[model samples]
Target: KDRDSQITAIEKTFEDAQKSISQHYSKPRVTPVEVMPVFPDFKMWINPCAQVIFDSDPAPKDTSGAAALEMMSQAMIRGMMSGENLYFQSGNDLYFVKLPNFLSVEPRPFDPQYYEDEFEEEGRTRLKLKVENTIRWRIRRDEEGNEIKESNARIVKWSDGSMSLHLGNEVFDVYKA
Candidate 1:
């Protein structure tokens, strides 16, 4: 059945990515395990925490994906640091992580319910990004070296310690400032 094959592909892809990221970020994590702890939340989010990493390769951060596929690969690197995105590159690799958005109010630095991520397949790509700071962030896409949408809402934290705005996504950390 198509479903069975799809499941197989996904599972295999996940397994492969796990192995890859494990080797990639294990060293840094060992040095800073104490600094980063299990970020819990009220909602069930990104299974298997701590599966993301910043991109430390040829590409620089802030560089948007020139092509859909390129973006997907770049996003995966962030997943190795923040555990926020799950990705699968058709016939090549599969990765996944759900990351919580950091805000000023949240006691911890994660909000699992919302975030943005991406998946890749050949030349096609799919993206899932949860823009937190409901009152601050606006939807935008990269084009012509300018942002398509802009947000005027500033990320403000109330006295209640409710960090509602996302400081940044894992991808942002991996790619640019």
Candidate 2:
């Protein structure tokens, strides 16, 4: 009977110690941010022209077949500066372009038939359809700055409210400023 009591006491002490250790070492739970229905003002590093294009008025039309030479020059100068161009806003059921490469998006509901299974399984609801009707921008410039490019692509809004621009063979993650 005495031996049994001793064993019980030892077991109790060991359990208490383990409980305390676990409590001390356990980390606080990190909760994800709530997802927003509309995309917030986001920015990404895509091309040097993004800033110039977004900042200009009326899309800077070409003059006398000069191919918007002045706009391209400004874009090149601005591209030399460090930091990603901040553009893109959500309104009227579309993501308005303040930058280039990705002109704009008429955001639509995610379609399980077309998108990956992981999107549905993970509850990623925000999506953009990549089709002919979808609007896209193409910029081709050969200057001292980086080459300009754009394509028809899709946007994925993650469960955390973050966005990623998916182009052909390239992915650019967008973030709120």
Candidate 3:
């Protein structure tokens, strides 16, 4: 397909990732969306689904859990960047695929949310955030190869912990048909 269409596909891949993660009952959501700019021949060759930042933020900043999420995302980006002919890359435009569906969850009602706590007041609000979350990354393509149709799903769980999706959910995977 074309650029617009490719962008649509990329976004759809993200939607499937969210749906699949939600299937785990973590209450997934798409936090930030930005298209990284490619240079030279890329001439602004956008990554469509580009920089997908799924956040269940303010996860406990402890020795074991602190920044685990940030690392997870970095790992995915690094793996892709190390490649050349397989994964899509244009002027540092990182691309990635789902790997057997992974999960990164932390306890609810985050600690030190708005800012850092002192010696006596450690459990403070650095910034408030949700309790649970899961994320994924796939791809989109159409009859002509790749095109824009705009069929994506990503959102925060308005309900507490009531919403859930199962592994066998038909809405979880992506394929070229």
Candidate 4:
């Protein structure tokens, strides 16, 4: 009975922690994605300018949600810099599996989409971003582990509460195998 109680308490605490962290990052909750689309693994690095639709206007600003994305990226970089290990899911047995020393997610370049305009008040500036396709990180590691720098996931930026459907179809093709 004591052992069961301890396990339950631990589980409850873990869930609370997860909720707290998620709450701290509110944009992710405020703008939930409609679909979690998957992308193909390109063994080489991905091109930043591929499969995009451009709209040039007002000196080209980013979406309002860009700040949230930027914050998330910065947080990840800071965490990794401070010696925090990343994790992933495996099987049904564990909540996380710590990644190997060789595999890590470091900061990559920020790829921006120009989509819309924002209103500006005296004290506030809204981020304006455009989105046709979600941003993704392309990773490359060579044999023999020479120079072996770690890579990270490219983030998807959402504008107008969601990413563009055209972008989704382009990446997640129903016909592609």
Candidate 5:
């Protein structure tokens, strides 16, 4: 009878221990964690060709992303000259141009096939940047004003990956270099 009571007591003790363990563990005390700020990378940081911008101001030429974004926006707002990365066609020739003073930018997913795989690295993806600056041409000076310089001069990438400069069909008078 005494042994039976002892066994009962032992069972009760085990039950009490299990209950205590469950009570202690069921609602675990979580350690306080110091929430630290985590910054993440955006698409432009990964892909440079993403929706880049260009403006007359070259100050932010080296700065890309948010800073460049501001420059481009300000250029638009201030009536400064600006152009988005784009393609141009001259005669039968087509070319892709990364405009001068490429500055602050708001980049998004752009054409992946813009460039033929001429070369590549960890970051720089090669897209043939055919750029021809506006050339001045003489159209036989009118009575008093001046020679007319059209907005047509540009350089473009030939289909064969060679650069071709176009100064319009009207030839400019050659001068000493």
Candidate 6:
């Protein structure tokens, strides 16, 4: 009778341990989005097919989100002048782009099949690839530390050829130029 009781207790402990292990393995894993910011000093290459257009005034401040996208398509239809440079400098403003790295896991040499399956699964994930280059434009000040009337707009590049200015909850479209 004692041996049977001890056996039952061991079985219960093993089951509990197995349940805990399964729970740990089945938990959700979160992947981080890595952001690499490119400085303004660097020359950002614009495709020959693309173009940049700048208005006399800074971008407007009353559009964003889905509306901004809608406006972009319209601008593309209007068409702008083609860019005239092998590469263009961002000037005094800072500019950068973002790219998603899906397969960033370390390789398991012993289990090649496992790694292959992992890669295949990650590849299946759909991505709406778009290039967004954010620009940090600094406000110019006078010697007395007074604000200048001509403060540069905060530029945000949407994909290629399209650009936008950020102002509060608003965004205005501009050319990549």
lDDT of 3: 0.27
Report the poorest 10 consecutive residues by lDDT, candidate 4: 123-132
Preferred candidate (lDDT higher): 4 or 6: 4
Worst 10 residues of 6 by lDDT: 79-88
Could you tally the backbone clashes for each prediction? 32, 0, 12, 9, 5, 2
Pairs in steric clash, model 5? 68-104, 68-105, 69-104, 69-105, 132-155
- Runs in model 6 with CA error above 4 Å? 1-153
- What lDDT score goes with residue 65 in model 2? 27
Provide the overall lDDT of each model, using Cα atoms, as 2-decimal numbers.
0.27, 0.32, 0.27, 0.26, 0.27, 0.26
RMSD values, in order shown: 21.1, 24.0, 23.4, 22.0, 34.3, 24.2
lDDT of 3 by residue, 1-177 (tens): 333443444344434433434222333443222222111011123323323347756444333322212112323334323222112233434332332222221211112223222222112221111111122222346888884322122322222333222221222322211
What is the lDDT, from 0 to 100, of the residue 118 in candidate 3?
Answer: 26
Of the pair 1 and 5, which is ahead by TM-score? 1
If ranked by lDDT, best first, what sequence of candidates would result? Answer: 2, 3, 1, 5, 4, 6
Cα lDDT tens digits for candidate 2, 14-36: 23322211111112232223222
Write down the TM-score for model 6. Answer: 0.17
Name the top lDDT candidate: 2
Error of 5 at 133 (Å): 7.8
Model 1 score (lDDT): 0.27
Off by over 4 Å in 3: 20-79, 84-177
| Model 1 ranges off by over 4 Å | 20-173
Model 4 regions lying over 4 Å from their true place: 1-75, 82-98, 110-177
Candidate 5 per-residue lDDT over residues 40-59, each given as its tens digit: 11112222333354755555
For candidate 6, lDDT tens digit of each residue in 1-177?
Answer: 233443343233223322211111122242112212212222333323322446656465443222211111222211111111111134323332221232111111112122121121222241110001112122246999896322112334432334443322233343432
The C-alpha TM-scores of every prediction are: 0.19, 0.22, 0.20, 0.17, 0.18, 0.17
Give candidate 1's error at residue 46 in angstroms. Answer: 17
